[PDB]
Amino acid sequence: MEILRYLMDPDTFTSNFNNDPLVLRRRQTYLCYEVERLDNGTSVKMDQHMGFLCNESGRHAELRFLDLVPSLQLDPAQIYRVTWFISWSPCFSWGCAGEVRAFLQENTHVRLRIKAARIYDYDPLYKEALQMLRDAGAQVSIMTYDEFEYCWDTFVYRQGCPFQPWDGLEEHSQALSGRLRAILQ
């Protein structure tokens, strides 16, 4: 879904990206993506390569992004930074980490930056997933206030309304980042 055509409902964003542990949004993932062409030491933003995806009929959003990479028309002679703002860290047991790993092996012109709102520890191999992504070249981190507000401002039908932080955004982000950094050693 291209933000040029459709922006995300605000409550869809809040419901899915809130990082409070006691709220349980296990059913869905929202993956906001953007692309930049790394040109000789500079980032060239590609405004049309921006959108968001959710799981659809059992197909995880991470696989659906890989599905559309061909339509992005990336030049394999160039270099690109793909950034994911994703509500859940990619999974291992349903294939996302392996598929993303394979994509990065055979698409070396792409560098993946994954910023996750929450760790998907419902997957018993969530740690194996994070390590496989790191070992594949992806830089994985936890979203902070800065990332949440950027996604609000970029991907949401907010109508000039500024980002309204949920309670404890900062505390949960710190704890999640400490967990992630420990996992990735």
Residue 118 found at the interface with Zn ion (CB under 5 A): no
Q: Torsion-angle region of residue 72: left (phi > 0), alpha (psi -120 to 50) or beta?
A: alpha
| Range in contact with Zn ion (rule: CB under 5 A) among 54-62, 66-74, 100-108, 149-157 | 54-62
Question: Of 3 and 96, which CB lies nearer to Zn ion in the complex structure?
Answer: 96
Nearest to 84 by CA among 103, 9, 128: 103
Residue 91 found at the interface with Zn ion (CB under 5 A): yes
> How far apart are alpha carbons 152 and 147 in whole angstroms?
9
Indicate which single residue of 69, 94, 125, 139 sits in contact with Zn ion (rule: CB under 5 A): 94
Of 62, 128, 147, 149, the active-site residue reads 62
Cβ 3 vs Cβ 53: under 8 Å: no
Question: Of 91 and 151, which CB lies nearer to Zn ion in the complex structure?
Answer: 91
Residue 54 found at the interface with Zn ion (CB under 5 A): no
> How far apart are alpha carbons 75 and 77 in whole angstroms?
5
Binding site for Zn ion (CB under 5 A): 60, 91, 94, 96
Question: Which residue numbers are catalytic?
Answer: 62
